[PDB]
């Protein structure tokens, strides 16, 4: 009948517990040892300059008010006990719309070790912001950040720290790559302190370095552009007596280049500078227009 003794243990733990007070409120600064396990790096939306990432966000602090002494060492409790204790309010500094999964039960976990060391993991789907400088499109490389810190707890109260060597904290699953356009190279973690109007906060940062794959842009822009330029220069080997043929060549190649520029600019965000593909398309347009001008002069 271990049910009764374990119920008594739990009721002794929560008897006289105030979940509005961080552990060690008077004489200590709480130390939250975080960790991340990226189950799948979601598709990097280039239009919204965002990216999705599905994580196992782990945290672990030391609560001395949750010490017990029973037959078991670690209490692997239900995810509904985590709402009756104090849990750090980690928010993502750049997350846009994050969801916490509730299928079929709340995807959370809580293991209370016998010496008070808690462990609290969640399964999140963070849609963070990745500002992109598309000046080398489509040969660009980005570093999408993921900054998370505490809300309402300054640096004098709750400090964050990685749980393993900072190089081994953010782990990415092997088969977890929903990236069809980019190519994930590696992560890079860092820890700093941001000032504010309310206080000084500890901020943990994680950059995922990306590298766009040029195959699709090649196939759908550079091949049609080059083929159009070739089809345009074909108009020089025709004899000078056939005027309508060369006129058709010139006009249709100019129209094809125009529609190619239009279809190539639709893929990108509505950006206000010129990309590399833009320069390539401009030069190909110049070449076809020069072919037409040469035919007109002839």
């Amino acid at each position, epitope marked *: 009948d271990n049910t009764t003794v374990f119920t008594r243990i739990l009721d002794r733990l929560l008897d006289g517990y105030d979940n509005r007070l961080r552990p060690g409120l008077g004489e200590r600064v709480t130390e939250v040892k975080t960790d991340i396990f990226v189950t799948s790096f979601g598709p990097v939306s280039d239009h919204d300059m965002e990216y999705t990432i599905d994580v196992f966000f782990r945290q672990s602090w*030391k609560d001395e008010r949750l010490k017990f002494k029973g037959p078991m060492t670690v209490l692997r409790l239900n995810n509904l006990m985590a709402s009756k204790i104090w849990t750090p309010d980690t928010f993502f500094h750049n997350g846009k719309k994050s969801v916490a999964h509730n299928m079929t039960m709340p995807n959370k976990l809580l293991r209370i070790t016998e*010496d008070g*060391t808690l462990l609290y993991t969640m399964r999140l789907t963070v849609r963070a912001e990745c500002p992109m400088h598309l000046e080398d499109f489509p040969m660009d490389a980005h570093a999408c950040p993921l900054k998370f810190g505490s809300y309402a707890y300054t640096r004098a109260e709750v*400090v964050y*720290e*990685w749980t393993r*060597e*900072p*190089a*081994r904290s953010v782990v990415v699953a092997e088969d977890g790559s929903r990236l069809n356009q980019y190519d994930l190279l590696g992560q*890079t*973690v*860092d*820890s*700093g302190i941001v000032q504010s109007s309310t206080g000084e906060y500890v901020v943990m940062t994680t950059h995922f370095h990306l590298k766009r794959k040029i195959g699709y842009f090649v196939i759908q822009t550079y091949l049609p552009c080059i083929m159009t330029v070739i089809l345009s220069q074909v108009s020089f080997w025709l004899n000078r007596e056939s005027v309508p043929a060369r006129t058709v060549f010139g006009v249709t190649t100019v129209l094809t280049m125009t529609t190619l520029s239009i279809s190539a600019r639709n893929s990108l965000p509505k950006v206000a500078y010129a990309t590399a593909m833009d320069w390539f398309i401009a030069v190909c347009y110049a070449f076809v227009f020069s072919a037409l001008i040469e035919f007109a002069t002839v």
Partner: antibody, heavy 117, light 106 residues
Framework: VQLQQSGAELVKPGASVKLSCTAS????????MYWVKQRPEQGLEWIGRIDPANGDTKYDPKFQGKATITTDTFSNTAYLQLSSLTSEDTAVYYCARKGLRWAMDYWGQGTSVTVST | NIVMTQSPKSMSMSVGERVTLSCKASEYVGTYVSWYQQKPEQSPKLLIY???NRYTGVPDRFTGSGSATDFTLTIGSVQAEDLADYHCGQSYSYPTFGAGTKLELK
């Protein structure tokens, strides 16, 4: 808060020495425990670390197999055992705990081992 | 294995002048470079945990300066008891220290 290492050792080449590091002022289950060697008039060198909560120990690639790191949670002690030692590792061995930003804030005092005949 | 090239190898400087030490990391180490001060016949003492964060009990004449790879330790008004080794060690990966700089008085 206060790390007490062992005393100096005078070991013959080809034997095993087990140095102890007793931590007083905290529990070793909270932090890691690094072992560092330093030959005379040279730079510091990492041997290995141990997570006393689990027992996961990592070693420097050039110290794998030669040294082993164990713990004792009841007495809050870390043990470093040099399995097979030559006459070259006559260095000073320090015991340190990880600090706030993964630094080594509290060091030991050094057990200067000596290998000779 | 991340290697830390610390410079210079050994410098000699008089009292009361500003001095600077450099520690260039091979790979990336965000701000996990620590500076330790080892006096002769003693155990190393942590001066700068992380880049540019003095440890409790360190005089304000020690200052760190961090980056991705290059790091700097500047001492201001140098006193007479600052004659010791100064090691820089990263912690972004498994810890690897530098060679150290023998500070001297002349």
């Amino acid at each position: 808060v206060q790390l007490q290492q062992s005393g100096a050792e005078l070991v013959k080449p080809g034997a095993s020495v087990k140095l102890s590091c007793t931590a007083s002022g905290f529990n070793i289950k909270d932090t890691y425990m690094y072992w560092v060697k330093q030959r005379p008039e040279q730079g510091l060198e990492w041997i290995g670390r141990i997570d006393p909560a689990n027992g996961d120990t990592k070693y420097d690639p050039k110290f794998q197999g030669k040294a082993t790191i164990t713990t004792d949670t009841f007495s809050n002690t870390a043990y470093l055992q040099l399995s097979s030692l030559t006459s070259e590792d006559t260095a000073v061995y320090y015991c340190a705990r990880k600090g706030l930003r993964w630094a080594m804030d509290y060091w030991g005092q050094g057990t200067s081992v000596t290998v000779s005949t | 294995n991340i290697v830390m090239t610390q410079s210079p190898k050994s410098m000699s400087m008089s009292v009361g002048e500003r001095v600077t030490l450099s520690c260039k990391a091979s790979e990336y180490v965000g701000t996990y470079v620590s500076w330790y001060q080892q006096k002769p016949e003693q155990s190393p003492k942590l001066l700068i945990y992380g880049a540019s964060n003095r440890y409790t009990g360190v005089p304000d004449r020690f200052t760190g300066s961090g980056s991705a790879t290059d790091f700097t330790l500047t001492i201001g008004s140098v006193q007479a008891e600052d004659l010791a080794d100064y090691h820089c060690g990263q912690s972004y990966s498994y810890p690897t220290f530098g060679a150290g700089t023998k500070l001297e008085l002349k």
